[PDB]
Structure 1
Amino acid sequence: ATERTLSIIKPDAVAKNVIGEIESRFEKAGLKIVAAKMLQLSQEQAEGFYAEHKERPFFGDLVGFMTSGPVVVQVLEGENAIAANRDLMGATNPKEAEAGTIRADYAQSIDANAVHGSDSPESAAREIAYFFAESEICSR
């Protein structure tokens, strides 16, 4: 069924000025961009989003990285979009990602892994509601 998931082009990717190349992967794969915006995450924003990692030993570096430069947050919509976005991105750790995935082709470390995607329907709904008001999501 058609779905919506949250996708973020991270600071490393946006600083490489490869936003176009990444958006083209999503589009070529059949996903549509239905909302997007570029912003520099505040400390509070980054922490509120990644709240479930508050206690992990990487939290401080994650929030640091995710706030280190501007990103693009967006909503991708398409058939089976949530799982499709995961297969497109590849394994969270670029060393374990198969050739041709976004992470294998664009990332440096498990931290700077170029993009984020929601990992379930429950997390998608939560993550879209975090960055976007419904009336911002432009249907088509």
Structure 2
Amino acid sequence: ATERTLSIIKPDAVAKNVIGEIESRFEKAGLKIVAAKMLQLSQEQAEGFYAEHKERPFFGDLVGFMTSGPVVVQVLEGENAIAANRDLMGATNPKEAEAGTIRADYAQSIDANAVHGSDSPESAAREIAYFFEESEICSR
């Protein structure tokens, strides 16, 4: 079925100026960029996004790294979008990630992985609504 998932191009990939190359991974795979914006996350913003990881000892690394630069936050829409996004991203850890995936090709570490993606249809709905309202989303 056609789903919506949240994608984020992280500061490390943005700084590498490979935004184009990454968006092409999604588009060539049949995913449509349906909402997008570049911004500099504030600490309060990043924290609210990673709300579910509030108490964990790595929270400061997440939030830390995710505010280290401007990011592109965006909605990808298409057939089996959430899971396809995960397939294209590779595993969370670049060392573990299958070659040909984004994290394998572009990431250096777990903090500095090249991208983010919603891991469930539950996280999809929440993560999208957090950054975007429906008017900003342009399905096609």
Both proteins in one fold, TM over 0.5: yes
**TM, length-normalised to structure 2:** 0.99
Q: CA-to-partner distance for each residue in 1:61-104, whole Å, 9 max, x for gaps?
A: 11110001000000000000011001000100111101010001
Looking at structure 2, the residues matched to 60 and 117 of structure 1 have their Cα atoms a distance apart, in angstroms, of 19
Where 2:91 maps in the other structure, the secondary structure is coil
Distance, in Å, in 1 between the alignment partners of 2:121 and 2:54 is: 22
CA contact (8 A) 2:9 2:19 kept: yes
Q: CA deviation at 1:139?
A: 1.6
Alpha-carbon offset, residue 54 of structure 1 = 1.2
Of all paired residues, the percent bearing the same amino acid is 99
Using the TM superposition, give the Cα deviation of residue 118 of structure 1 relative to its aligned residue in structure 2, in angstroms.
0.2
In 1, are the aligned partners of 2:77 and 2:139 still within 8 Å (CA)?
Answer: no
**Normalising by the residue count of structure 1, what TM-score does the alignment of the two structures yield?**
0.99
d(CA) in 1 for partners of 2:49, 2:65: 14
In structure 2, what is the Cα distance between the partners aligned to 1:90 and 1:57? 24
Cα offset for 1:58?
1.1
* RMSD of aligned alpha carbons: 0.5
Provide the secondary structure at the position in 2 that maps to 1:8. strand
What pairs with 1:2-41 in structure 2 (closer than 5 Å)?
A: 2-41=2-41
Note the residue ranges of structure 1 that are not aligned, 5 or more in a row.
none
Aligned partners of 1:47 and 1:106: how far apart in 2? Answer: 25
CA deviation after TM superposition for structure 1 residue 28, in Å: 0.5
Task: State the 1:12 CA deviation.
Answer: 0.2
The answer to whether the aligner puts 1:132 opposite 2:139 as a matched pair is no
Structure 2: how far apart are the matches of 1:119 and 1:59? Answer: 17
In 2, Cα distance between equivalents of 1:12 and 1:98: 19
Q: Distance in 2 between matches of 1:51 and 1:59?
A: 9
Give structure 1 regions of 4+ aligned residues with deviation exceeding 3 angstroms.
none
Residues 15-36 of structure 1, C-alpha deviations (whole Å, 9 max, x = no match): 0000000000000011000000
Other structure's SS at 1:95 match: coil
Using the alignment, how far apart are the partners of 2:99 and 2:66 within structure 1?
25
The whole-number CA distance in structure 2 between the counterparts of 1:139 and 1:30 is 14
Secondary structure, aligned partner of 2:95:
helix
